[PDB]
From a paper:
The m6A “writer” consists of the catalytic subunit m6A-[name] complex (MAC) and the regulatory subunit m6A-[name]-associated complex (MACOM), the latter being essential for enzymatic activity. Here, we report the cryo-electron microscopy (cryo-EM) structures of MACOM at a 3.0-Å resolution, uncovering that [name] and [name] form the core structure of MACOM and that ZC3H13 stretches the conformation by binding [name]. Our cryo-EM structure reveals that [name] forms a homodimer, with each monomer consisting of four tandem helices (H1–H4/H1’–H4’ with coiled-coil interactions) and three linkers (L1–L3/L1’–L3’).
After extensive trials of expression and purification, we obtained four complexes containing different MACOM components: HWVZ (containing [name], [name], [name], and ZC3H13 (1106–1668)), HWV (containing [name], [name], and [name]), WVZ (containing [name], [name], and ZC3H13 (1106–1668)), and WV (containing [name] and [name]). To understand the structural basis of the MACOM function, we determined the 3.0-Å resolution structures of the HWVZ and HWV complexes using single-particle cryo-EM analysis. Notably, the overall structure of the HWV complex lacking the ZC3H13 component is similar to that of the HWVZ complex based on superimposition aligned by [name], although the horse body is slightly stretched out upon ZC3H13 binding. These results suggest that [name] and [name] form the structural core of MACOM with only minor conformational changes upon ZC3H13 binding, and [name] is not part of the structural core of MACOM. Moreover, the side chain of R109 from L1’ and the indole ring of W987 from the Neck domain form cation–π interactions in addition to the hydrogen bond between the side chain of R109 and the main chain of W987. These specific interactions allow [name] and [name] to form the MACOM core, and most of the interactions remain in the structure of the HWV complex when ZC3H13 is removed.
Author numbering:
A (entry chain A): 333 to 579, 619 to 1409, 1428 to 1521, 1530 to 1585
B (entry chain D), C (entry chain C): 64 to 247
The structure:
């Protein structure tokens, strides 16, 4: 009785029952089969070859002639059978020893020199084939070869003078076979004593001059040696970490993360850099010559992984307290585990090493408990489902083996014990309930003829009855129908259907009255008489365009299969490093374009975003996981097809592509799919869609050279300017797309400079990045009237995601070049001045909440390098029509000097003071401050970081006035003391500040009185900052040539002779503040006692120094030169997510009471909306092809 | 092997199935309820809560619409003011021609970049790219063949030098053998 | 046997209840998707911007404004058309625009004519023919590579044979030089 309550981890793994181990070679598989199975039908088939083998090594015991060489060419075909049979029968003449002796005799150069004219090289290649056939024979055979010194015998062919290349390449193929086994690999890396190791000999061999394919084979062996060495280093690091903490260093964990990443990147590029290419196959840039078959290196990579106990090692790492805490160890380990679970060989590796796999699953589950304990899995920490996915994948492959091994026991009889079969099918069906489990079941059944386990399952129960209820419902038949339906629905990889379509269609046709079989037959409409090659692209495209009307109607559900196949046979997998391009992927695209493929994919996208557009508005997001999976698969396949039709067309040479139906449909599909994820973050399948959209839109930017941009009448009609127009005009089209357009433009636009990179970068990449940004600025300055509307429209909004993405756009889009930053900043400042003169005409300035939101936008922008300089180079007043910006900045400064009692002015003054802090912040600049070489001198850098002298005097007076004001808030006071700290770090700003204190001598006294009159445990930050600035004016007399002594500062602290009173009051207030909660209290105490000591260490009354050398800055460099000379790369909150918890929309968004119905007769007449919206919730309420 | 236990198991199974089916009914009623309760009306459309940006967009579009309407009425009355003259009539005819030309020019320009004569150009560009990739690969293979041919030349030179050494040693051995065979 | 059919019936009920648990999973995940734990920000975004009433009103207003603007510009250019007269700036500009549109329409017509499509098809056929010529050259190159490797193997074999013969002659010469010296 199988229980329905499914605990995903109540089932463990058991030893492999049907599939053989992936790392086991053919000989070991054969010997295990013949050891456990015993006698069988093929035992006779083994004996006729075993007798020939044992007679063949006996008839040649002392002869090394032509007939011996002929026997050497027949031994390899007899190895797998005869040698295994002899090993099981316990041969007493050491057949393996005689074979190794033959191999070493053949491989020597002094035995080849005793042969007839044309069979000595034949002897050498027969010997190297014997080396390759005895190295794939288990540890016994490999040790027998090595004890005879096969490495030192193979490296006699390689080092032989005047030898062929097709023979050295065969010897490389034999050396790779020897080092494939772990014993041979150890004997290769760490050779015999008093002799050079195989690795050193191979390096010395490679250092010579040899054919390109020979050195390619040498590099292929070296790349596998590197993988084995990386695995051994990982083993050593894991042993260190599991022995130190069991009774720790961060370097041994960062290096371990790097080594795990290297393992993953070596397994990605394993079938390209770790395999021995055929003898006739050359390493050309694109594969044009040689056989098309290449042996996979995973059967030996998994042997390396198992000999080093990689699963047990990652189990230890995922259970060590210090290593478990790192978030990079888990990601690096799960990347390797995901790559292993992608393949059939890797998943059989997981199942064969079941003892370690169970503990690995348990450790991953305990991480799912640890993340639950932390509670941070909602955001930042991704909602990882890899543990459950891997558990379900291994469990469904275990169930597949159970299904397969239940039909091997029926090759001589008929099925009688179906309780086990139904239990397996049930425990497999309940895996398909979760979306993760359903995805795992769809994935595993699509790997290397796994769906046959169910196809044969229904072919067996097509004999008992039709499959339905006549005398029995045939529950196994129904389970098989459901499982094949869910794998066909959920599997995006459709390689299984290539070989199973005929069988599945026959099963569907033979039973016409099944609810699941009819849907399965509708899922396989495109695969009727189809060959799954590049020549059947027209057939699939014709099918897709014939029933594009029935897109997600359950009648045209096979269009999803047609797109999955068409994306499977005409879209290359993501290229890896080292892969030589196959030329069939270009013919696939040429066939995808010959038959109308641009029209019938744009049409698919248009129909998709025309069907999804109605449920999207009504908060209906394809509820059922079947429809969600179908829509995601359809969209992803269409996007991949469009990307591979555009990347392979709009690359390199400039080809005009002015279709403009791809961007105008992608800006809407992004809205409908990737714009507003209700979970707060895009999941694994709606992020691939967004990346595909970004890549397709960016393919309109590639292929544009610096000759279509010379003329403005050709720049505005370019294939890039047109895409930018179609993306920018689709933002302000509908308010539902306001966020979608912003989040799309934030990915299209380049990242802000400088890049955070871990290594130094050549100047060529710096130049190409700056040229890319210049091109983006040129192609965006033709859309000036659209960026102006985007930044004039979303400014003042209270929707936190939209405002955040607007101020992110205005950061990305001002970091490109001078014109595109000056455009945005002119727009923002002109909008501010027009807002302030909008209600204060012929009157004193009046501030509303629109003004404070606008100032918040300006401040969020002003805290960045390029926007700060764009503000600065406008507010200086350089004559370009920029008087209004200077006057409005003076108006803001006057506002801060006199804030008043209004609650909205107190909210604007903090934004303006933060703007003042940002402008005066030296660190925020295009040219980062650096006294050493690599950048301009610091005094020449403050001219591109700080305002001019008049604006600096105005800012200093404003700061002093707002510090002296008794009505100023606390955040504004903190920001102003931070700004004074910023200005005290250099002689120029400090001189301006010092000159400002003479016209306002009570500013410091007023600020100190304010901080001591209202001091608490939370206001102590302002006091600490004030004392830090207080020392920064005195930390130079111990430096800065511009400063003041203690006497003048003390007399400046007093307008009435009571400064010691205030300093004391501050001293003994710390004692009553309990002085123990944090070290900040002690820091403030030591600072204040130091200043008190300086108080009585010098006479107080002494007027401030009047005349001294004035530090004058240089002329300010033009903004275009600053952007060109900007620091592009450096060695190393706003960007993590747009759906912030609360920044502006805390509890009051000033939603305006809009009267829509009465605002209709004034404009063009229109009927009542209520019926319009209520008509949309009856028919298109449920998911499917909507009427609108 | 008793039947009473099987009957009891069947009864408890059908009871559990019935419980699951009443949970079907409740859950599907909840699904039907949540998916369609957003009823708009008139009393809540007279006081719609819009964001300040949306209200500003509505105000801006309403104002622009008002100026466009009033200037369009001014344009219509100015059209009515003018009377028919041969220059006016030929101008009207040619302006209608210009509007038709603009419409069909946009239509032709969207046929050129979307129609068959755009797929043809894409096919031509892709065929040129494929042929140039194949030609570059063949050029690299030609250099590899050059390497093989220079290996052939080296081995031929080795054959020649070994053959000359063999000839000289063989003739020396023969002359020495028929030299000292008679003096013994 | 009564037990076999009873077990089959139990299997039927377990199958039905398994499908019922599947529909439990679907309805419960749909519930969790509809009533998901969501930030205030996403609710604000979907209630202020994605509000169907606001979206429909915005779309209608944009459409009406676009129609009014296009009618206004049509009326402005048309009243300019009654102001069209020869030898006047308006007349010259308007006639020049008309002639430019004539030329542009002729260019689009020649770029869309069947002659240009036939020319592009001929160029595509020529590129394809060049592609099969390259593939035939590649087949010849593969045959040349095969024959070069066979030549290399034969040359290595004859090099080894020559080395064998040269050795045999060298040791024969040395042994007979030591042997014949004793008879002097």
């Amino acid at each position: 009785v199988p229980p329905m309550t499914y605990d995903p981890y109540d089932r463990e793994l058991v030893p492999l029952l049907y599939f053989s181990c992936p790392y086991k070679t053919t000989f070991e598989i054969e010997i295990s089969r013949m050891k456990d199975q015993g006698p069988d039908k093929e035992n006779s088939g083994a004996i006729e070859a075993s007798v020939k083998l044992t007679e063949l090594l006996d008839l040649y015991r002392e002869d090394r002639g032509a007939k011996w060489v002929t026997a050497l060419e027949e031994i390899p075909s007899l190895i797998i059978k005869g040698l295994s049979y002899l090993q099981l029968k316990n041969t007493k003449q050491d057949s393996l020893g005689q074979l190794v002796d033959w191999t070493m005799q053949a491989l020597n150069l002094q035995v080849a020199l005793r042969q007839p004219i044309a069979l000595n090289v034949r002897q050498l290649k027969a010997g190297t084939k014997l080396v390759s056939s005895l190295a794939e024979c288990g540890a016994q055979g490999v040790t027998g070869l090595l004890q005879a010194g096969v490495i030192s015998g193979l490296f006699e062919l390689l080092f032989a003078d005047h030898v062929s290349s097709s023979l050295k390449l065969n010897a490389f193929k034999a050396l790779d076979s020897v080092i494939s086994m772990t014993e041979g690999m150890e004997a290769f890396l760490r050779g015999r004593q008093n002799e050079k190791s195989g690795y050193q000999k191979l390096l010395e061999l490679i250092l010579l001059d040899q054919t390109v394919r020979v050195v390619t084979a040498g590099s292929a062996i070296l790349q596998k040696c590197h993988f084995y060495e990386v695995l051994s280093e990982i083993k050593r690091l894991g042993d260190h970490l599991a022995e130190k903490t069991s009774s720790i260093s961060e370097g041994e964990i960062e290096r371990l993360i790097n080594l795990l990443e290297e393992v993953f990147h070596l397994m990605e590029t394993a079938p390209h850099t770790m395999i021995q290419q055929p003898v006739k196959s050359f390493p050309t840039m694109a594969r044009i010559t040689g056989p098309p078959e290449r042996d996979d290196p995973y059967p030996v990579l998994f042997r390396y992984l198992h000999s080093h106990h990689f699963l047990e090692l990652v189990t230890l790492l995922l259970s060590i307290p210090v290593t478990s805490a790192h978030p990079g160890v888990l990601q690096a380990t799960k990347d390797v585990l995901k790559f292993l679970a992608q393949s059939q060989k890797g998943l059989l590796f997981f199942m064969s090493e079941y003892e370690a796999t169970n503990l690995l699953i348990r450790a991953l589950c305990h991480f799912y408990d640890q993340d639950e304990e932390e509670g941070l899995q909602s955001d930042g920490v991704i909602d990882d489902a890899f543990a459950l996915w891997l558990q379900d994948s291994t469990q469904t492959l275990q169930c597949i083996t159970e299904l397969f091994s239940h039909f091997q026991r029926c090759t001589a009889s008929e099925e009688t014990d179906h309780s086990d079969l139904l239990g397996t099918l049930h425990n497999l069906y309940l895996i398909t309930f979760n979306p993760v489990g359903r995805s795992a079941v769809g994935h595993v059944f699509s790997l290397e003829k796994n769906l046959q386990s169910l196809i044969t399952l229904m072919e067996y129960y097509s004999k008992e009855a039709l499959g339905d209820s006549k005398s029995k419902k045939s529950v196994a038949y129904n389970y098989a129908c459901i499982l094949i339906l869910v794998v066909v629905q959920s599997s995006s990889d459709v390689q299984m259907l290539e070989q199973h379509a005929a069988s599945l269609l026959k099963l569907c046709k033979a039973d016409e009255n099944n609810a699941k079989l009819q849907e399965l037959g509708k899922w396989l409409e495109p695969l009727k008489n189809l060959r799954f090659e590049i020549n059947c692209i027209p057939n699939l495209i014709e099918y897709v365009k014939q029933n594009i009307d029935n897109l997600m109607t359950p009648e045209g559900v096979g269009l999803t299969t047609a797109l999955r196949v068409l994306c499977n046979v005409a879209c290359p997998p993501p290229p890896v490093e080292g892969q030589q391009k196959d030329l069939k992927w270009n013919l696939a695209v040429i066939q995808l374009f010959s038959a109308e493929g641009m029209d019938t994919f744009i049409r698919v996208l248009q129909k998709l975003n025309s069907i999804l557009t109605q449920p999207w508005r009504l908060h209906v997001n394809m509820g059922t996981t079947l429809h969600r999976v179908t829509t995601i698969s359809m969209a992803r396949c269409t996007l991949t097809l469009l990307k591979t039709m555009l990347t392979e067309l709009l690359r390199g040479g400039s080809f005009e592509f002015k279709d403009m139906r791809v961007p105008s449909a992608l800006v809407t599909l992004h809205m409908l799919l990737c714009s507003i994820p209700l979970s707060g973050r895009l999941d694994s399948d709606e992020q691939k869609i967004q990346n595909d959209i970004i890549d397709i839109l960016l393919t309109f930017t590639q292929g544009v050279n610096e000759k279509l941009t010379i003329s403005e009448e050709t720049l505005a009609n370019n294939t890039w300017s047109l895409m930018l127009k179609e993306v920018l005009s689709s933002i302000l089209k509908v308010p539902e797309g306001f966020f979608s357009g912003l989040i799309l433009l934030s990915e299209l636009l380049p990242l802000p400079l400088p890049m955070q990179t871990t290594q130094v970068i050549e100047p060529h990449d710096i130049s190409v990045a700056l040229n890319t940004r210049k091109l983006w600025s040129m192609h965006l300055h033709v859309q000036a009237k659209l960026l102006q509307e985007i930044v004039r429209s979303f400014s003042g909004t209270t929707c936190q995601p939209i405002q955040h993405m607007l101020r992110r756009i205005c950061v990305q889009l001002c970091d490109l070049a001078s014109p595109t930053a000056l455009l945005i900043m002119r727009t923002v400042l002109d909008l501010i001045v027009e807002d302030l003169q909008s209600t204060s005409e012929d009157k004193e300035k009046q501030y509303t909440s629109q003004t404070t939101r606008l100032l918040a936008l300006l401040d969020a922008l002003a805290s960045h390098k390029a926007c700060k300089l764009a503000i600065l180079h406008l507010i200086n007043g350089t004559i370009k029509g920029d008087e209004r910006y200077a006057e409005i900045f003076q108006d803001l400064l006057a506002l801060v000097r006199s804030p008043g009692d209004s609650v909205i002015r107190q909210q604007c003054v903090e934004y303006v003071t933060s703007i003042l802090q940002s402008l005066c912040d030296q660190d925020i600049a295009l040219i980062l401050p650096s006294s050493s070489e690599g950048s301009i001198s610091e005094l020449e850098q403050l001219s591109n970081s700080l305002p001019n002298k008049e604006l600096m005097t105005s800012i200093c007076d404003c700061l002093l006035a707002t510090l002296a004001n008794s009505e100023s808030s606390y955040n504004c006071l903190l920001t102003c003391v931070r700004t004074m700290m910023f200005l005290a770090e250099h002689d120029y700003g400090l001189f301006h500040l010092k000159s400002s204190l003479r016209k306002n001598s009570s500013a410091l006294h007023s600020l100190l009185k304010r901080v001591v009159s209202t001091f608490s445990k939370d206001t102590g930050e302002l006091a600490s900052s004030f004392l830090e600035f207080m020392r920064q004016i005195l930390n130079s007399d111990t430096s800065r040539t511009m400063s003041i002594n203690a006497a003048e500062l003390k007399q400046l602290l007093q307008s009435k002779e009571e400064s010691p009173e205030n300093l004391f009051l501050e001293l003994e207030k710390l004692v009553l503040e309990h002085s123990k909660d944090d070290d900040n209290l002690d820091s403030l105490l030591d600072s204040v006692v130091g200043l008190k000591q300086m108080l009585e260490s010098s006479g107080d009354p002494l007027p401030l120094s009047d005349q001294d050398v004035e530090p004058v800055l240089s002329a300010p460099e033009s903004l275009q030169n600053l952007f060109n000379n900007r620091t592009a790369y450096v060695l190393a909150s706003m960007w993590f997510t747009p759906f912030q918890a609360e920044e502006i929309d805390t509890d009051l968004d000033l939603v305006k009471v809009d009267l829509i119905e009465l605002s209709e007769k004034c404009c063009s007449d229109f009927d009542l909306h209520s019926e319009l919206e209520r008509s949309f919730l009856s028919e298109p309420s449920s998911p499917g092809r909507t009427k609108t | 092997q008793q039947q009473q236990e099987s009957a009891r198991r069947e009864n408890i199974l059908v009871m559990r199935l019935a419980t699951k089916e009443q949970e079907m009914q409740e859950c599907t009623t909840q699904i039907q309820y949540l998916k369609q309760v957003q009823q708009p009306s008139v009393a809540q459309l007279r006081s719609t809560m819009v964001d300040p940006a949306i209200n500003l967009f509505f105000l801006k579009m309403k104002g622009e619409l008002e100026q466009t309407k009033d200037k369009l009425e001014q344009a219509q009355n100015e059209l009515s003011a003018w009377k028919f003259t041969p220059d006016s009539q030929t101008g009207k005819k040619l302006m209608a021609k210009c509007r038709m030309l603009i419409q069909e020019n946009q239509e032709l320009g969207r046929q050129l970049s979307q129609g068959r004569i755009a797929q043809l150009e894409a096919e031509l560009a892709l065929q040129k790219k494929y042929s140039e990739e194949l030609k570059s690969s063949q050029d690299e293979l030609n250099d590899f063949i050059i390497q093989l041919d220079e290996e052939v030349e080296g081995m031929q030179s080795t054959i020649l030098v070994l053959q000359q050494q063999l000839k000289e040693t063989r003739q020396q051995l023969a002359q020495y053998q028929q030299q000292q065979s008679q003096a013994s």
